[PDB]
Design a protein around this ligand. Structure first.
Ligand SMILES: [K+]
Ligand SMILES: [Mg+2]
Ligand SMILES: [Mg+2]
Ligand SMILES: [Mg+2]
Ligand SMILES: [Mg+2]
Ligand SMILES: [Mg+2]
Ligand SMILES: [Mg+2]
Ligand SMILES: [Mg+2]
Ligand SMILES: [Mg+2]
Ligand SMILES: [Mg+2]
Ligand SMILES: [Mg+2]
Ligand SMILES: [Mg+2]
Ligand SMILES: [Mg+2]
Ligand SMILES: [Mg+2]
Ligand SMILES: [Mg+2]
Ligand SMILES: [Mg+2]
Ligand SMILES: [Mg+2]
Ligand SMILES: [Mg+2]
Ligand SMILES: [Mg+2]
Ligand SMILES: [Mg+2]
Ligand SMILES: [Mg+2]
Ligand SMILES: [Mg+2]
Ligand SMILES: [Mg+2]
Ligand SMILES: [Mg+2]
Ligand SMILES: [Mg+2]
Ligand SMILES: [Mg+2]
Ligand SMILES: [Mg+2]
Ligand SMILES: [Mg+2]
Ligand SMILES: [Mg+2]
Ligand SMILES: [Mg+2]
Ligand SMILES: [Mg+2]
Ligand SMILES: [Mg+2]
Ligand SMILES: [Mg+2]
Ligand SMILES: [Mg+2]
Ligand SMILES: [Mg+2]
Ligand SMILES: [Mg+2]
Ligand SMILES: [Mg+2]
Ligand SMILES: [Mg+2]
Ligand SMILES: [Mg+2]
Ligand SMILES: [Mg+2]
Ligand SMILES: [Mg+2]
Ligand SMILES: [Mg+2]
Ligand SMILES: [Mg+2]
Ligand SMILES: [Mg+2]
Ligand SMILES: [Mg+2]
Ligand SMILES: [Mg+2]
Ligand SMILES: [Mg+2]
Ligand SMILES: [Mg+2]
Ligand SMILES: [Mg+2]
Ligand SMILES: [Mg+2]
Ligand SMILES: [Mg+2]
Ligand SMILES: [Mg+2]
Ligand SMILES: [Mg+2]
Ligand SMILES: [Mg+2]
Ligand SMILES: [Mg+2]
Ligand SMILES: [Mg+2]
Ligand SMILES: [Mg+2]
Ligand SMILES: [Mg+2]
Ligand SMILES: [Mg+2]
Ligand SMILES: [Mg+2]
Ligand SMILES: [Mg+2]
Ligand SMILES: [Mg+2]
Ligand SMILES: [Mg+2]
Ligand SMILES: [Mg+2]
Ligand SMILES: [Mg+2]
Ligand SMILES: [Mg+2]
Ligand SMILES: [Mg+2]
Ligand SMILES: [Mg+2]
Ligand SMILES: [Mg+2]
Ligand SMILES: [Mg+2]
Ligand SMILES: [Mg+2]
Ligand SMILES: [Mg+2]
Ligand SMILES: [Mg+2]
Ligand SMILES: [Mg+2]
Ligand SMILES: [Mg+2]
Ligand SMILES: [Mg+2]
Ligand SMILES: [Mg+2]
Ligand SMILES: [Mg+2]
Ligand SMILES: [Mg+2]
Ligand SMILES: [Mg+2]
Ligand SMILES: [Mg+2]
Ligand SMILES: [Mg+2]
Ligand SMILES: [Mg+2]
Ligand SMILES: [Mg+2]
Ligand SMILES: [Mg+2]
Ligand SMILES: [Mg+2]
Ligand SMILES: [Mg+2]
Ligand SMILES: [Mg+2]
Ligand SMILES: [Mg+2]
Ligand SMILES: [Mg+2]
Ligand SMILES: [Mg+2]
Ligand SMILES: [Mg+2]
Ligand SMILES: [Mg+2]
Ligand SMILES: [Mg+2]
Ligand SMILES: [Mg+2]
Ligand SMILES: [Mg+2]
Ligand SMILES: [Mg+2]
Ligand SMILES: [Mg+2]
Ligand SMILES: [Mg+2]
Ligand SMILES: [Mg+2]
Ligand SMILES: [Mg+2]
Ligand SMILES: [Mg+2]
Ligand SMILES: [Mg+2]
Ligand SMILES: [Mg+2]
Ligand SMILES: [Zn+2]
Ligand SMILES: [Zn+2]
Lengths: 154, 181, 141, 110, 53, 69, 123
RNA sequence: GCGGGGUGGAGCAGCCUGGUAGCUCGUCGGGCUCAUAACCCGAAGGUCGUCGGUUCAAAUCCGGCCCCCGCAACCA
RNA sequence: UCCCCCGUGCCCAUAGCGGCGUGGAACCACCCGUUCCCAUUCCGAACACGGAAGUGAAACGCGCCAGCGCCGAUGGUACUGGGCGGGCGACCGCCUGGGAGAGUAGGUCGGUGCGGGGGA
RNA sequence: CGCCUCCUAAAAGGUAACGGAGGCGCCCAAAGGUCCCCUCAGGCGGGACGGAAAUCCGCCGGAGAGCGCAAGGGUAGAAGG
RNA sequence: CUGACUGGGGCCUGUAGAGCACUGAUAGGGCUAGGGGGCCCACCAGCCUACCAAACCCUGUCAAACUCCGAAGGGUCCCAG
């Protein structure tokens, strides 16, 4: 966190035409908008391989806007193992569920957390095969709520 | 209706103390006695004989209320039990017939239990209901060892409007239920 | 050897092998995977051969996830018989396996140990394969 | 989860509502008794009567019969003769029967 | 039908005619079936009795 | 209640051997039991009939100290 | 149930009827009747409900009886087994406790003979 | 390809027709005998090859699996 | 016309579960009784009747809450009618029209017809 | 070798093979008609003999029970008791 | 003039695909009735599972005779060509 990625608008271009043009079709939505977008595939790849559904990606839209999104869905082409479409969930002050990575001082990489977009953390830390831990007994930095059942095994 | 010792005791001693011990705002919140359901799980009477008749006749005398037969729900080979056989006599006691039987049950019946050391405090329901099993019906004064023919105990479900156990343990103790532990 | 412990029916009709894998197309247990590129019925014997391969390379170490399962009964008429007289007897079990399916995953092992072991395992299989590595693309599913 | 009450209500009303008659429906409270002839093809009520409206009082049974005549009276007036008597969840007996005996008395055909 | 589940006629007991054929199980139902049925000759309902088919 | 199927409950005087009278209703006019809730030792709080022992065994195995100090 | 919780048999004498209570042998029967002025020979059937409650009162207040007595018997044996006393080892394996021999007999304490095969003579 | 069989230690009933495991020998204990066999008096031992289903209930009825005997394999 | 309640429909859970709050003037319930009608394979629990002292505790009505349940886009895909190609095959791809399911955003703690009682 | 159920059967109907699975050759005098009332399986908790399972009580429980016997459809707003 | 086929409109369906809510299968993990496993104990208890054991939970799948879903089409009727 954070990362900047170009995004452009689309309206009637074929998804196949855009994919054949090296771009990645997508959509940009939240409670207030919904826009047909396309990112550049090779550009997106390095952004997302670090900024997974964990870290904020900011879409410099060509009209000057810079909307702060999270990646919420990446439909993959099961044959070629390639992103086929992206969901960019635009952030706004309202809360959001999201997966936050876990570092341990190892079942779960991350955890679902009920966060506020200003309170978006990079880390959630754990402590010290086979004894294992659960979500209840965990840190929770300022402003995050356990968006699972604490009965889950980490 | 008609006035009896346990009943007038419930309203006089038990109901005020209950409001004291728990603080009910409404006068219906405070626990009540719903009913006393008596079950003899005979089975011994499955087919061998119709002993249900003398067992009902004594269940009638103990309670002043004729019991209804309970027939077998499903068939069970291991119980030598075909579906629909008469295997129990159950009689629901309410209102005055309930207080009159409980009054005798506390006053004579439970004392007459040999080696009676107190009613099991743990038989409460999690729901404010109480059940207790007996093994001789001659504990009851309407039953003499002359009139009997075979020892037959029963299940006694006393049911209350108490949502919790502690509320119903208070109601049952204050009424005169001797609890052991 | 893998086979359904219990079945509602002994024999199933021969499949069709249309389309990319339905599910299990993303790594979600281990570090590396072996993905099918062409469709096939994969026999329990193939899976087992591919498994022992990765084991005896890991010299009993690491972990091995088998993300396909041979539930489809495979039938075969006795040798030299004529057609008809009903369906042959069940002779083995296959997992229907379509392109993009992650058949195996390995974890708890060096990147070289996984690459090499998955490669040997691919040789025990009647199809072409790809060795893939758990991505955020995977992690986003 | 249904009670025996609403099951009983459905089980007599479904049967009644199939015959295609105007449904003389009878509601009975601990104090009052109510009635409304009802067209279920329109979901619309044509004539009504009740202890609460007529402000009658006294014997529940005797009162039930009176609204029965009171309902029938207004019924014939609007051109209604034939009718299907809906006892809903009640046994055909006592108050509901009294209200029925009076509706016939006033000329409701059922 | 079987050897225990037999066919039988019903005979109007007034004009002695057989008007109905039915079946019974004579092990379950030994007694001769008596059933009121409409008799087309008497043109009225009549207690019919079971006679051998 | 149904008619003709129940025993008639009548005013009944239940007597316990401790001269105790109880006035309830029953299918019997007068009943003489031998123990009631008013005299059962569990009911009488703590009537310890014979057994006050506690224990006194077996450290009251005393009597005496006759090994020389 | 009358005294203690036992219905002592009518039609018999009152000094034998009391023996049918666990805890009352012939000797304790002789006591209570003398200590209560009841004819030790009159039949139970012919005892007034004052004689009944006079004999009853003394009987279950002098000595511990039927159920209770068996508690103090059981808990004593219990304590013998609990501490590891040699009699507790005896009561565990259900063998004699009072120095009797077990090579033969002890059949009361051990029960029906669990007959087993024996050693074989040569042919 | 067809058929029959699996149940105390051995050899056979019970299955057909669902509830009840039976018979001979053997094994064990005791007698008679100087002793042994024979003989006489008693007793024990079988969840019925296995799994699954129908059933209130399966040795028994229905399916698969194991195992073991028997038959057949002709016209070319 | 508007609010409340009673009854009866319609939609067929965006209406349900759970949690909470609230209502007794009225209406509804519980309730008070079991003489009478009627009733219990026993029980006035239910069914029923006669009542009107009490309570909204239960039930019910009305609200709030999105934990569940339920609903649920847009976009992308699968598949496909029809038209075409490719591969030895298993199978795959293109054009045109159609287009899911899952999942994401999000929604929802009902909406309304008719009659009746009360209210302003 | 006739009949019934399901699948194959390509979302109307129909659709073959010595294709994959089952069942029928009865039954019921109520297991029929109608009126009236009642609602299960199972889970947890409580209850003498009493058990995993008899009968009793409380709570949860939309239908997974039941509907004589195969299967499918249907079904508690009953076709179940 | 009603025909094949075609336009609009209504209804009917359960395949493709998908799904796992039911019936089954099913990988790894948590939690856990009946034990095996067992330092021990049976005097009355226990006790611990880097193993099998439902149920529940999480992750991940499969199915002609599974479907919470469900197309394109197909059929039929009406009107029009
Ligand atoms: K020849
Ligand atoms: Mg790339
Ligand atoms: Mg990738
Ligand atoms: Mg999410
Ligand atoms: Mg008060
Ligand atoms: Mg009375
Ligand atoms: Mg308790
Ligand atoms: Mg007595
Ligand atoms: Mg209660
Ligand atoms: Mg084929
Ligand atoms: Mg398939
Ligand atoms: Mg998926
Ligand atoms: Mg092959
Ligand atoms: Mg094959
Ligand atoms: Mg073979
Ligand atoms: Mg064949
Ligand atoms: Mg074959
Ligand atoms: Mg696949
Ligand atoms: Mg290969
Ligand atoms: Mg690589
Ligand atoms: Mg009235
Ligand atoms: Mg008047
Ligand atoms: Mg009605
Ligand atoms: Mg017949
Ligand atoms: Mg003629
Ligand atoms: Mg005849
Ligand atoms: Mg000393
Ligand atoms: Mg004695
Ligand atoms: Mg010795
Ligand atoms: Mg053998
Ligand atoms: Mg043999
Ligand atoms: Mg023989
Ligand atoms: Mg035979
Ligand atoms: Mg037989
Ligand atoms: Mg034998
Ligand atoms: Mg011998
Ligand atoms: Mg010699
Ligand atoms: Mg000899
Ligand atoms: Mg079996
Ligand atoms: Mg048997
Ligand atoms: Mg069985
Ligand atoms: Mg077999
Ligand atoms: Mg020849
Ligand atoms: Mg107006
Ligand atoms: Mg309403
Ligand atoms: Mg309030
Ligand atoms: Mg409320
Ligand atoms: Mg009021
Ligand atoms: Mg008030
Ligand atoms: Mg009367
Ligand atoms: Mg309330
Ligand atoms: Mg509202
Ligand atoms: Mg939600
Ligand atoms: Mg909640
Ligand atoms: Mg829906
Ligand atoms: Mg959806
Ligand atoms: Mg779409
Ligand atoms: Mg495709
Ligand atoms: Mg196409
Ligand atoms: Mg076409
Ligand atoms: Mg095509
Ligand atoms: Mg070709
Ligand atoms: Mg080839
Ligand atoms: Mg394509
Ligand atoms: Mg294609
Ligand atoms: Mg298109
Ligand atoms: Mg297309
Ligand atoms: Mg959708
Ligand atoms: Mg989206
Ligand atoms: Mg949401
Ligand atoms: Mg809301
Ligand atoms: Mg809601
Ligand atoms: Mg309404
Ligand atoms: Mg309407
Ligand atoms: Mg209005
Ligand atoms: Mg007005
Ligand atoms: Mg108004
Ligand atoms: Mg023919
Ligand atoms: Mg035929
Ligand atoms: Mg078809
Ligand atoms: Mg079909
Ligand atoms: Mg046709
Ligand atoms: Mg042909
Ligand atoms: Mg008859
Ligand atoms: Mg029938
Ligand atoms: Mg029927
Ligand atoms: Mg009938
Ligand atoms: Mg229980
Ligand atoms: Mg039990
Ligand atoms: Mg069913
Ligand atoms: Mg059958
Ligand atoms: Mg024309
Ligand atoms: Mg045409
Ligand atoms: Mg298709
Ligand atoms: Mg498919
Ligand atoms: Mg499933
Ligand atoms: Mg599928
Ligand atoms: Mg399908
Ligand atoms: Mg849907
Ligand atoms: Mg078709
Ligand atoms: Mg067409
Ligand atoms: Mg068409
Ligand atoms: Mg059309
Ligand atoms: Mg035309
Ligand atoms: Zn005639
Ligand atoms: Zn006393």
């Amino acid at each position: 966190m954070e990362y900047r990625l170009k995004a452009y608008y689309r309206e009637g271009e074929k998804p196949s035409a855009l994919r054949r043009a090296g771009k990645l079709p997508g959509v940009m939505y939240n409670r207030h908008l919904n826009r047909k977008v396309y990112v550049d595939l090779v550009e997106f790849d390095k952004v997302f391989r670090q900024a997974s559904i964990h870290h904020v990606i900011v879409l410099e839209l060509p009209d000057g806007q810079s909307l702060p999104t999270l990646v919420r869905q990446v439909n993959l082409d099961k044959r070629r193992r390639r992103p086929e479409h992206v969901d960019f969930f635009v952030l706004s002050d309202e809360p959001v569920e999201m997966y936050v990575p876990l570092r341990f001082v190892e079942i779960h990489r991350d955890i679902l957390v009920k966060v506020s977009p200003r309170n978006i953390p990079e880390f959630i830390e754990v402590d010290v095969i086979g004894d294992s831990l659960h979500a209840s007994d965990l840190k929770l930095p300022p402003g995050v709520e356990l968006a699972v059942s604490p009965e889950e095994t980490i | 209706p008609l006035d009896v010792a346990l009943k007038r005791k419930y309203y006089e001693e038990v109901r005020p103390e209950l409001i004291r011990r728990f603080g009910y705002q409404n006068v219906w919140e405070v626990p009540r006695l719903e009913k006393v359901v008596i079950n003899q799980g005979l089975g011994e009477a499955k087919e061998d004989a119709r002993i249900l008749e003398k067992a009902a006749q004594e269940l009638a005398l103990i309670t002043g209320q004729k019991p209804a037969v309970t027939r077998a729900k499903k068939s069970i080979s291991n119980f030598k039990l075909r579906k629909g056989m008469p295997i129990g006599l159950r009689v629901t006691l309410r209102r005055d017939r309930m207080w009159i039987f409980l009054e005798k049950l506390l006053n004579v019946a439970l004392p007459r239990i040999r080696d009676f050391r107190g009613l099991n405090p743990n038989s409460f329901d999690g729901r404010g209901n109480y059940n207790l099993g007996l093994r001789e019906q001659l504990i009851f004064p309407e039953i003499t060892y002359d009139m009997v023919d075979a020892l037959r105990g029963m299940d006694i479900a006393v049911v209350t409007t108490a949502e919790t156990d502690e509320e119903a343990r208070a109601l049952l103790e204050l009424l005169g239920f001797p609890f052991r532990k | 050897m893998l086979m359904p412990r219990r079945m509602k029916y002994r024999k199933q009709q021969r499949g069709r092998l249309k389309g990319a894998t339905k599910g299990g197309d993303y790594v979600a247990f281990g570090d590396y995977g072996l993905v099918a590129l062409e469709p096939a019925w994969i026999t329990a014997q193939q899976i087992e051969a591919a498994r022992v391969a990765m084991v005896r390379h890991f010299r009993r170490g690491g972990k091995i996830f088998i993300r396909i399962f041979p539930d489809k009964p495979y039938t075969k008429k006795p040798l030299e018989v004529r057609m008809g007289k009903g369906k042959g007897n069940v002779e083995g079990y296959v997992a229907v396996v379509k392109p993009g399916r992650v058949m195996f995953e390995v974890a708890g092992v060096t990147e070289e140990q996984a690459m090499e072991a998955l490669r040997i395992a691919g040789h025990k299989l009647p199809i072409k394969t790809k060795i893939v590595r758990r991505d955020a693309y995977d992690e986003a599913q | 989860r249904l009670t025996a009450y609403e099951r009983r209500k459905f089980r007599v009303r479904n049967r009644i509502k199939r015959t295609g008659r105007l449904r003389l429906s009878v509601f009975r409270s601990l104090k009052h008794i109510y009635a409304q002839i009802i067209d279920d093809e329109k979901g619309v009520t044509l004539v009504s009567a009740s202890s609460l409206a007529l402000k009658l009082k006294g014997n529940k049974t005797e009162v039930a019969r009176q609204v029965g005549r009171a309902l029938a009276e207004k019924a014939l007036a609007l051109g209604i003769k034939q009718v299907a008597f809906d006892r809903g969840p009640y046994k055909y007996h006592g108050r509901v029967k009294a209200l029925a005996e009076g509706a016939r008395e006033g000329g409701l055909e059922f | 039908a079987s050897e225990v589940r037999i066919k039988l006629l019903l005979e109007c007991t007034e004009c002695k005619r057989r008007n109905y054929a039915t079946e019974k199980n004579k092990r379950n139902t030994p007694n001769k079936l008596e059933l009121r049925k409409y008799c087309p000759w008497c043109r009225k309902h009549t207690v019919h009795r079971e006679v051998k088919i | 209640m149904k008619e003709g199927i129940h025993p008639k409950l009548v005013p009944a005087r239940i007597i316990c051997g401790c001269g105790n009278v109880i006035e309830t209703y029953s299918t019997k006019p007068e009943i003489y039991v031998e123990v009631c809730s008013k005299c059962h030792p569990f009911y009488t709080g703590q009537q310890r009939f014979v057994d006050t022992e506690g224990r006194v065994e077996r450290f009251q195995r005393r009597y005496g100290d006759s090994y020389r100090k | 149930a009358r005294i203690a919780g036992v219905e002592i048999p009518r039609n018999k004498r009152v000094d034998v009827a009391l023996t049918y209570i666990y805890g009352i042998g012939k000797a304790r029967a002789k006591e209570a009747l003398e200590k209560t002025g009841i004819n030790p020979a009159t039949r139970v059937k012919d005892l007034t409900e004052a004689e009944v409650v006079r004999l009853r009162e003394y009987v279950e207040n002098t000595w511990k009886l039927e159920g209770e007595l068996r508690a103090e018997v059981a808990a004593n044996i219990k304590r013998l087994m609990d501490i590891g006393c040699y009699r507790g080892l005896r009561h565990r394996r259900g063998l004699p406790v009072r120095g009797q021999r077990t090579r033969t007999n002890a059949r009361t304490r051990k029960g029906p003979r669990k007959t087993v095969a024996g050693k074989k003579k040569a042919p």
